[PDB]
Amino acid sequence: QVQLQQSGPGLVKPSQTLSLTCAISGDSVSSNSAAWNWIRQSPSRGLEWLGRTYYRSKWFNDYAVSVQSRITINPDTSKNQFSLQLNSVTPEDTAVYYCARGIVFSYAMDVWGQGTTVTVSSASTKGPSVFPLAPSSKSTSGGTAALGCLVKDYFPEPVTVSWNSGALTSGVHTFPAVLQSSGLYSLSSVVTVPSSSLGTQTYICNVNHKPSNTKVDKKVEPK
Amino acid sequence: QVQLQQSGPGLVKPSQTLSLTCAISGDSVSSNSAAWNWIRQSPSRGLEWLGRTYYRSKWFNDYAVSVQSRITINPDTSKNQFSLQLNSVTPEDTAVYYCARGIVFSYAMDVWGQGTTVTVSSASTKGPSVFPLAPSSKSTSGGTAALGCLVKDYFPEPVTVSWNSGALTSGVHTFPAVLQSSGLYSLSSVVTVPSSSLGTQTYICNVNHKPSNTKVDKKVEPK
Amino acid sequence: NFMLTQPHSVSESPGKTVTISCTRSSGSIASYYVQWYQQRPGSSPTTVIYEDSQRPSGVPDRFSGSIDSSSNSASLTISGLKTEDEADYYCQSYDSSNVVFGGGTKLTVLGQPKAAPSVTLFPPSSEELQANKATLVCLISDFYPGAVTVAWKADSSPVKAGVETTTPSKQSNNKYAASSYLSLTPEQWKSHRSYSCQVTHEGSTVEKTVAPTECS
Amino acid sequence: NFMLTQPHSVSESPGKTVTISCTRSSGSIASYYVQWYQQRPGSSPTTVIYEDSQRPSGVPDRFSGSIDSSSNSASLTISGLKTEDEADYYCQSYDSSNVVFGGGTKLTVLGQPKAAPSVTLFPPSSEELQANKATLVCLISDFYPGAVTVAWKADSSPVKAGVETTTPSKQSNNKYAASSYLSLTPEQWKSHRSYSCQVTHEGSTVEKTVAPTECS
Amino acid sequence: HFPICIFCCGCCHRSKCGMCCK
Amino acid sequence: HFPICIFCCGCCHRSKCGMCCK
Numbered sequence: 001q002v003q004l005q006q007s008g009p010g011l012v013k014p015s016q017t018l019s020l021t022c023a024i025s026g027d028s029v030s031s032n033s034a035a036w037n038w039i040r041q042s043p044s045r046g047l048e049w050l051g052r053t054y055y056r057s058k059w060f061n062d063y064a065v066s067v068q069s070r071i072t073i074n075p076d077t078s079k080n081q082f083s084l085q086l087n088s089v090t091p092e093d094t095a096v097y098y099c100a101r102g103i104v105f106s107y108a109m110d111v112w113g114q115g116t117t118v119t120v121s122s123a124s125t126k127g128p129s130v131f132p133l134a135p136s137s138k139s140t141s142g143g144t145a146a147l148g149c150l151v152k153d154y155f156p157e158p159v160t161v162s163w164n165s166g167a168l169t170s171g172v173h174t175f176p177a178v179l180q181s182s183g184l185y186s187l188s189s190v191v192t193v194p195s196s197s198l199g200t201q202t203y204i205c206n207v208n209h210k211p212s213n214t215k216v217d218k219k220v221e222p223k
Numbered sequence: 224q225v226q227l228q229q230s231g232p233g234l235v236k237p238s239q240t241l242s243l244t245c246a247i248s249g250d251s252v253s254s255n256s257a258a259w260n261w262i263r264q265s266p267s268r269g270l271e272w273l274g275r276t277y278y279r280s281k282w283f284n285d286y287a288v289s290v291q292s293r294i295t296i297n298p299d300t301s302k303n304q305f306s307l308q309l310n311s312v313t314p315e316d317t318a319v320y321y322c323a324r325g326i327v328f329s330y331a332m333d334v335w336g337q338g339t340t341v342t343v344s345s346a347s348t349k350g351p352s353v354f355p356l357a358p359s360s361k362s363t364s365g366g367t368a369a370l371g372c373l374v375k376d377y378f379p380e381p382v383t384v385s386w387n388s389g390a391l392t393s394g395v396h397t398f399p400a401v402l403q404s405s406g407l408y409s410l411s412s413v414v415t416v417p418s419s420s421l422g423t424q425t426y427i428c429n430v431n432h433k434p435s436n437t438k439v440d441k442k443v444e445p446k
Numbered sequence: 447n448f449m450l451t452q453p454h455s456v457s458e459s460p461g462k463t464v465t466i467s468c469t470r471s472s473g474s475i476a477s478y479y480v481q482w483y484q485q486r487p488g489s490s491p492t493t494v495i496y497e498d499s500q501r502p503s504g505v506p507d508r509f510s511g512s513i514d515s516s517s518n519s520a521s522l523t524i525s526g527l528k529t530e531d532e533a534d535y536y537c538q539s540y541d542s543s544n545v546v547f548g549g550g551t552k553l554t555v556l557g558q559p560k561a562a563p564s565v566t567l568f569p570p571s572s573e574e575l576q577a578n579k580a581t582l583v584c585l586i587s588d589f590y591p592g593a594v595t596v597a598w599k600a601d602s603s604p605v606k607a608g609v610e611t612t613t614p615s616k617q618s619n620n621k622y623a624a625s626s627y628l629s630l631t632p633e634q635w636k637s638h639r640s641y642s643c644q645v646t647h648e649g650s651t652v653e654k655t656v657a658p659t660e661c662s
Numbered sequence: 663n664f665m666l667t668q669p670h671s672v673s674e675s676p677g678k679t680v681t682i683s684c685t686r687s688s689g690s691i692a693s694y695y696v697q698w699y700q701q702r703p704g705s706s707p708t709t710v711i712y713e714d715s716q717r718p719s720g721v722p723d724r725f726s727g728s729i730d731s732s733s734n735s736a737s738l739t740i741s742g743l744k745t746e747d748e749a750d751y752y753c754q755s756y757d758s759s760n761v762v763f764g765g766g767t768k769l770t771v772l773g774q775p776k777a778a779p780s781v782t783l784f785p786p787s788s789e790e791l792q793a794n795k796a797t798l799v800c801l802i803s804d805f806y807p808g809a810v811t812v813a814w815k816a817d818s819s820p821v822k823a824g825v826e827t828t829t830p831s832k833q834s835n836n837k838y839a840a841s842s843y844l845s846l847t848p849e850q851w852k853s854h855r856s857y858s859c860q861v862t863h864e865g866s867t868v869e870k871t872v873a874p875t876e877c878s
Numbered sequence: 879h880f881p882i883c884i885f886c887c888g889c890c891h892r893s894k895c896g897m898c899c900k
Numbered sequence: 901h902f903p904i905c906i907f908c909c910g911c912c913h914r915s916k917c918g919m920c921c922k
Binding site: 270336354364375409 | 479481483490491492493496497502536538539540543544545547549550564566567568571573574577579581583585587610611612613615617618623624625627629654656
Binding site for chain 4: 567602640648649650651652653654655656657660661662
């Protein structure tokens with residue numbers, strides 16, 4: 001079976017060079033019937049083919065017009081791998097990068113690698129600021145009120161959130177993070193509770209951010 | 224204690240004359256310290272003073288400018304009552320009409336009568352047409368779906384609605400009727416049910432309109 | 447030709463003090479006597495304050511009127527609120543040419559948590575369009591306090607013609623429901639890209655929108 | 663410089679047949695080979711159809727590709743749907759100058775009743791405004807199938823700057839939640855009469871609106 | 879004897895405006 | 901010996917367009 005192993009930095013600062021390698025096993029990088037492609041995916045740009053390398057008595061490389069001026073795709077027959085570089089990265093280059101085997105003629109992908117997330121951000125380690133998402137009649141439906149905590153502007157991932165030190169799990173939902181144009185993440189955690197408990201039960205979110213060695217407890221009460 | 228008893232037709236055709244009487248007991252229509260008022264109320268026009276009659280060595284009558292050209296308020300000392308007439312009625316005269324005792328000087332009302340609804344409509348007896356309000360993802364919240372029946376264009380009131388011949392009462396709400404510009408009523412009845420029952424439980428609304436001797440059963444299923 | 451303006455609703459916990467104001471558009475509030483009327487749902491009004499602050503026989507001393515010739519506004523204050531005091535309150539006055547009522551204020555005495563309405567917009571049924579009519583039904587449910595404002599739109603424009611709306615009323619669980627209707631011809635229904643039912647409650651709004659091309 | 667356009671989502675009961683189309687903006691669909699890719703959440707894509715209708719080794723014969731040179735559109739058809747088939751599907755092709763992917767189609771295999779999202783819009787907290795920022799959080803919950811479209815407005819105008827939105831994902835009960843954020847400066851927040859979060863699901867829309875002057 | 883009612887201010891016998899009789 | 905790859909139609913050896921080699 002063909003295997004594709006991806007490797008390289010997952011964080012890259014703006015203006016620097018993104019550099020990834022795909023190590024092939026089970027097939028040849030000089031294979032006479034394959035092409036070796038790079039494809040990236042973001043929410044908002046969706047799937048985008050970057051380029052590809054192949055040997056037909058000679059190495060040929062095709063490239064997407066959008067990136068041709070900053071892209072390098074190079075084979076290495078001594079290691080049975082191909083690389084991707086992208087110079088002068090901007091936050092618009094944040095994406096999951098896939099290597100893949102495909103078909104020369106039909107620009108088809110055959111076998112997909114597992115992918116590598118690369119984030120482009122100039123941030124370093126920063127702990128979150130936590131703000132309440134206070135329940136009110138506008139978050140209450142029936143006898144049920146939503147309340148939450150907003151976890152802003154931290155780096156890197158991940159943050160984890162519990163409620164009441166883990167005593168409250170029913171009804172809790174912690175969303176995935178967004179990466180903002182600042183190069184920092186934000187997420188929310190919400191919990192749904194009886195609206196009649198709002199007067200008398202304490203709700204505390206516990207935000208953990210191991211990378212910055214920070215924990216924040218925030219009591220969320222009605223407005 | 225002062226009592227005010229109201230009397231007169233509750234339905235009046237457009238262009239005809241509305242005519243109501245208020246019979247006073249416990250006080251005098253010629254009382255030297257009282258005025259005898261007519262006030263109407265609709266949703267949309269709210270409370271509206273119409274006019275008033277009083278005896279100060281002589282009968283005096285004050286009237287709202289808006290209705291002065293079509294209004295008559297007359298005392299009757301022989302019966303201890305006062306009347307209201309309004310000529311040339313239009314559907315804008317549909318309202319609850321109150322007689323009241325009040326204070327001459329301060330245009331104040333003292334003692335309110337119980338009120339009489341007068342409807343202005345040219346309709347006669349007409350049975351309803353019933354249409355489904357079918358449940359869909361847009362009426363479903365959580366594991367709960369709203370469905371209903373719309374009861375259009377009947378006259379006079381009332382219509383009553385049950386669900387499943389009265390087997391289904393939990394979650395049922397039948398709204399009050401609206402009177403449309405056609406001079407006919409419409410209402411809805413809604414019921415909230417488990418959304419998982421929509422495939423397999425039958426929901427039938429039973430619309431009764433005694434005045435037209437009509438009953439309509441309508442099965443409401445998902446769209 | 448003045449008006450008297452009161453908040454649409456006002457709510458407060460039992461035992462507490464509440465005030466309901468009434469602003470006069472023109473004319474001096476102090477020059478003319480102000481009455482306050484109480485009206486419980488399905489009942490005729492009752493006078494609670496007359497001639498600015500006179501309290502009729504039988505009205506609890508918890509009720510008092512006052513006048514603020516400055517803001518040009520009368521005020522009805524109720525202390526030690528009890529659930530019986532829950533009602534609509536109307537101010538009323540006059541000038542030389544007309545008698546004027548205020549638009550009324552629903553006073554809720556809070557007995558349970560406040561809750562924003564759930565709104566479901568039903569498009570015309572296919573059966574009704576065969577009958578050559580098209581009625582949009584906006585069902586407004588489970589809200590508290592029971593005071594809402596409803597508006598309709600066609601595409602992005604306000605629609606006023608063909609709307610009828612019921613006064614909120616209590617459900618079995620003591621929250622309130624209300625209904626509203628937009629009657630159109632099938633040509634009007636098919637003429638637009640969308641229709642919306644908008645409901646404001648406690649100073650925020652929910653709008654539900656449906657398309658005749660629904661789908662999907 | 664063409665595009666390939668697919669429905670945002672498509673849903674169908676297990677056992678049934680479903681089709682997902684892909685329309686080419688320019689160029690002849692028949693002149694260039696069309697691939698289809700499957701992508702389950704948190705996984706890399708997998709090829710299911712290549713060169714219009716070739717089915718790679720290991721792909722069930724329930725999967726087939728076809729071409730309609732008339733409507734200028736490729737199509738992926740799946741018969742006897744099973745819950746494993748639930749995924750995003752992307753079509754892909756090329757011309758002489760670029761390789762193009764379609765925008766993808768979420769295929770849901772219906773396991774429970776459909777449900778419109780509940781939406782709650784949280785205004786900026788007072789604490790955050792002290793920090794000189796103002797973030798509106800739109801919480802989108804309990805919907806099924808798990809595909810929505812989110813848009814923001816300021817007053818009545820579309821707002822695009824400062825928005826971030828998460829991809830819907832499963833809650834503990836197998837319905838989906840999603841979140842969206844509008845980041846403003848406190849001057850922007852106070853500069854407008856209202857802000858709205860709009861969510862479309864299954865071809866109808868809910869919009870929640872809050873005012874900086876809330877109140878009340 | 880000869881009956882009037884009149885709309886007036888600072889009159890019979892009140893600080894404010896309103897309708898005054900007999 | 902002298903290697904080419906060329907983007908072409910009705911070519912090696914297919915009904916459609918695409919990239920043709922060696």
